[PDB]
Design a protein around this nucleic acid. Sequence first.
DNA 1: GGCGGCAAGGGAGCTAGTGTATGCCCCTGAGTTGGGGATATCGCCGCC
DNA 2: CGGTGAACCTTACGTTCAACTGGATCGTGTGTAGGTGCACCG
Lengths: 109, 196, 122
Amino acid sequence: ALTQPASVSGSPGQSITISCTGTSSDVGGYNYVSWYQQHPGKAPKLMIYDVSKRPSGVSNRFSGSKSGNTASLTISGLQSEDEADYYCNSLTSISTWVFGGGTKLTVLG
Amino acid sequence: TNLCPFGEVFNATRFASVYAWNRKRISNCVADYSVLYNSASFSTFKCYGVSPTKLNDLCFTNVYADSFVIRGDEVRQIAPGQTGKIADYNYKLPDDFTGCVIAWNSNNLDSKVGGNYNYLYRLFRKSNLKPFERDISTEIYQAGSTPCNGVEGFNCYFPLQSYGFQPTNGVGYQPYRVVVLSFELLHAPATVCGPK
Amino acid sequence: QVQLVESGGGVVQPGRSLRLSCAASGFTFSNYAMYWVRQAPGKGLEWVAVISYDGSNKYYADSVKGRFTISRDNSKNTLYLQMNSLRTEDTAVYYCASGSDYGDYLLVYWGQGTLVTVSSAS
DNA sequence: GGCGGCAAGGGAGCTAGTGTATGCCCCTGAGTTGGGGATATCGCCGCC
DNA sequence: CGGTGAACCTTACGTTCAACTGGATCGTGTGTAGGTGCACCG
Ligand SMILES: *[C@@H]1O[C@H](CO)[C@@H](O)[C@H](O)[C@H]1NC(C)=O
């Protein structure tokens, strides 16, 4: 599987970064990562399409990036309503769709 | 005077297989290539027989837009005087080509999981292809000196082979949508030029 | 909009069969590859199975290899997952993802998904 | 108040609507979408 | 739901005088799964 921080915290307004890493096969060789946001008790829905892109209708603040073997999400001016789980996906060789794991975002309320 | 229907070609839902490349006539419009950009990351836009910088200051009797799909390592074969499976069996361009080609990656949109069998290319043919010729017959192509009376099997293969597009293919093995505009001009009124 | 509804299934005894059906509408079902993705209660996601756009090729996660069977029928526009030889650890909520236009290697629509509980109790 | 030095006289970047140099895709090609090098006019400030 | 058996160009490269000599090794470098399944005790 992939490795992600257990939890990430941040006050509203600033920039928050969430990074996930895997071997070369998962993301280091294939630039097919794509991150999903799952709210509590809700169906996960795509947030970052492809390595760095966004499906129509999602917030412009989210921005994905790739640094060599790692893939990161950057959130600008995150609000309280952005509190939810975030998973980083990746297409590896011979199919085998690995998943990020778990990453929770909280606001200092 | 109206904009050329470049959307109907570039935005088309599905492109025909290379062995059955489409051909749409475009005329009585203005070619505004400015809007053509910002539509996927184009991989090739190279023109022969006409300087692109002055493309907006000249027009022709008509233009033919032929669309198809091919793998990246194959796109280099779409050019005059080239050789290769596509160049000799599927799509052949004359040495005096008056027009030019456009190619853009379509991996995200045209590479199904497990193999996209909707696209076929002719892998076997008795003889090369004349310029701008279409072949769609699926007769069994015998290779040896043993006639097979049109039955697939040993030494008698099906001429067409399906492209096995997959997301995990190579960087250049992914599908590439290609649109070739052949500018044809004769002693007839001009049809398709953009702003002066 | 695009809808995807899971038939679901109540608590079942370990090692018993179970058929889950995802019915889709609002888009060309027969042109994209569906996925089944499980989520254990309180845990992260985990890809389970995927089926090609015509059913020719099916891929399973190693954890469920040789036990599950994913199929689909485009006549009535439905997708099926047959579960055999269940295990207690297998309880989870199942999502029927689509992989819509501009991406087939990725999961997009993520219908509501049902719940399946595998416990030996009444 | 005039002189000499200044991310500057030649380095690097690309993204089409369009300006003067952190710009111009200028000029087109390995086809994987991009290569190096073209006229500097320059303009504005610390110092003794 | 597995053991055989015979295949079918099998599908996915890493390339150009060619073809299968008619072997799974065979010129230059291939390689394999399902099943078509019909009793089992179930
Ligand atoms: C093709 O579709 C894209 C995205 O849907 C759109 O932005 C573009 O304008 C279309 N093509 C043309 C030539 O307008």
